[PDB]
């Protein structure tokens, strides 16, 4: 039942909160978002009415601190900030609630969509991908490049996704070239799961974060990361049964949530065709294959 107050809304803007969005007018008496469910990460996001081509926002968890938004007229954006004075913050939220100048997080009781998209996403993992250690919240935008994209130019403002490269020495054991290239099980299970992520929950949490950044900001490097992590599982002959069952649920909710009109720029034809019809796991993603065939048969 947490609140993110706004000092003010001086510029006309579309405000996203998770999968929801609403329009605020220039100098509209808007003072923030209340009734935000505890237990999940959340993302508050912005597109200015005067610049539709750019999208930015803040990943946060209300359990980690008291957060508010304030427009900076110098840097020209809505900034998240932490209020360390808990009494001052309670005093501010109470006043704005009493004067009813806040939007209510519009969750339908039946509706598990946000849990389903964020099941394995944890703030401590977000803060390792998005490095700005003096804040407890994480800024992402449309234009931020990944470490992978940078290697193929400012490291401070990059997305530190785990680098996946099917044609790398990390991916291919000397003397196992054909075996490891055609069946990525060793790369998935030994290198990535045992070696880097430690468990499938961390791997799924990064996959789910990558999708959400692709959807909410149009972040191209995030879309590449999401597809590479799906392709690594689908191109492995040996995957734990619980991982395939969970991946099918994860992708089902992602495909269900995607805007119908963005299917063309958010879904890679080659990867999905390979994953559903050619790959080792072509028969393992029943829920995903059914929603993809019924929602985007053109792509396939």
């Amino acid at each position: 039942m947490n609140t993110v107050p706004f000092t003010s809304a001086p510029i006309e803007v579309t405000i996203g909160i998770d999968q929801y969005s609403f329009n605020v007018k220039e100098n509209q008496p808007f003072h923030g978002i209340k009734d935000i469910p505890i237990g999940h990460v959340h993302v508050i996001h912005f597109q200015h009415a005067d610049n539709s081509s750019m999208r930015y926002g803040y990943w946060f968890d209300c359990r980690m601190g008291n957060f508010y938004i304030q427009y900076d007229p110098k840097d020209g954006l809505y900034k998240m900030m932490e209020e360390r004075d808990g009494a001052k913050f309670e005093n501010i939220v109470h006043n704005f609630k009493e004067r009813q100048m806040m939007v209510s997080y519009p969750k339908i009781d039946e509706d598990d969509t946000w849990y389903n998209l964020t099941e394995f996403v944890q703030m401590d993992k977000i803060r390792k991908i998005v490095r700005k250690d003096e804040n407890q919240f994480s800024y992402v935008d449309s234009s931020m490049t990944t470490v992978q994209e940078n290697e193929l130019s400012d490291p401070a403002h990059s997305l530190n996704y785990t680098v996946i490269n099917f044609k790398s020495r990390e991916a291919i054991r000397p003397g196992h070239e054909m075996e490891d290239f055609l069946d990525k099980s060793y790369y998935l299970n030994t290198v990535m799961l045992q070696g880097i992520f430690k468990n499938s929950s961390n791997y799924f949490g990064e996959l789910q974060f990558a999708f959400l950044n692709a959807m909410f900001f149009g972040n191209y490097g995030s879309s590449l990361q999401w597809h590479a992590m799906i392709e690594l599982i689908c191109s492995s002959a040996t995957v734990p049964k619980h991982m395939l069952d969970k991946l099918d649920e994860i992708l089902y909710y992602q495909i269900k949530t995607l805007p119908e009109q963005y299917s063309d720029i958010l879904l890679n034809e080659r990867v999905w065709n390979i994953c559903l019809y050619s790959s080792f796991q072509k028969n393992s993603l029943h829920n995903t294959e059914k929603i993809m065939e019924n929602k985007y048969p053109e792509l396939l």
């Binding site: 790398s168 070239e177 054909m178 290239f181």
Partner: protein
């Protein structure tokens, strides 16, 4: 990127490069079984790995034993090729290792890139050129050493014989590609043109007959004629 008619002189510059052709690695005869089903019998094959500047040919013979108990042999053949090319580069002194390897078939790019990950500075390239290296097994001395092999073997040849004494690599490669194109289009006709006059022999240490400069011009004319005729009948043109 891709090697084409536009960047053709690059083949004869001082950057070491090799062509790799995998056409003849996995070779079969198709036959009826007693029950009237169809089966294949593998025969010995070869990797054709050629330095187009020097004429040095690294003919790795692929013995049928390689295939015993293996599945998906047309797929394995590309990986075995990449393994053997990789083994060849590693066997050469650093100053003899190629800067680029050009694969005659795009299906060899991923297998060769993966086997050569240790060599990031060696460029793996496709070509738009339709090179007739599949006709290598029409050269009698190359066919002989492949079909007689009882075990894996590497045999070294100079596919230009002594031509570079008299002509440039550009001209030598043009003559090679014209002879192999003729052999590919009509092997019998091409072989008759090469071996009809018995006064012109093949030296023991050579692949092709010992033509004078004048005789090469006649031979080259006879090959172009053979190729155009066959084009006419193909396309009823």
């Amino acid at each position: 990127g891709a090697m084409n008619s536009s960047n053709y002189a690059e083949l004869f510059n001082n950057d070491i490069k090799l062509f790799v052709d995998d056409t003849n690695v996995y070779r079969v005869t198709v036959h009826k079984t007693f029950e009237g089903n169809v089966a294949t019998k593998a025969i010995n094959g070869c990797i054709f790995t050629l330095n187009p500047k020097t004429g040095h040919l690294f003919l790795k013979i692929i013995h049928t034993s390689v295939w015993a108990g293996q599945k998906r042999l047309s797929q394995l053949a590309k990986w075995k090729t990449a393994e053997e090319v990789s083994a060849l580069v590693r066997s050469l002194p650093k100053e003899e290792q190629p800067k680029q390897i050009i694969v005659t078939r795009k299906a060899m790019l991923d297998p060769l890139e993966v086997h050569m990950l240790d060599f990031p500075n060696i460029a793996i390239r496709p070509t738009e050129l339709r090179l007739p290296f599949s006709a290598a097994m029409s050269i009698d001395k190359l066919s002989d050493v492949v079909m007689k092999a009882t075990e894996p073997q590497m045999v070294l040849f100079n596919i230009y014989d002594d031509w570079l004494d008299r002509i440039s690599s550009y001209t030598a490669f043009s003559r090679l590609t014209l002879l192999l194109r003729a052999l590919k289009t009509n092997e019998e006709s091409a072989k008759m043109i090469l071996l009809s006059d018995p006064t012109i022999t093949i030296k023991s240490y050579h692949l092709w007959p010992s033509f004078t400069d004048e005789q090469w011009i006649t031979i080259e004319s006879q090959m172009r004629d053979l190729i155009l005729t066959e084009y006419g009948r193909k396309y009823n043109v």
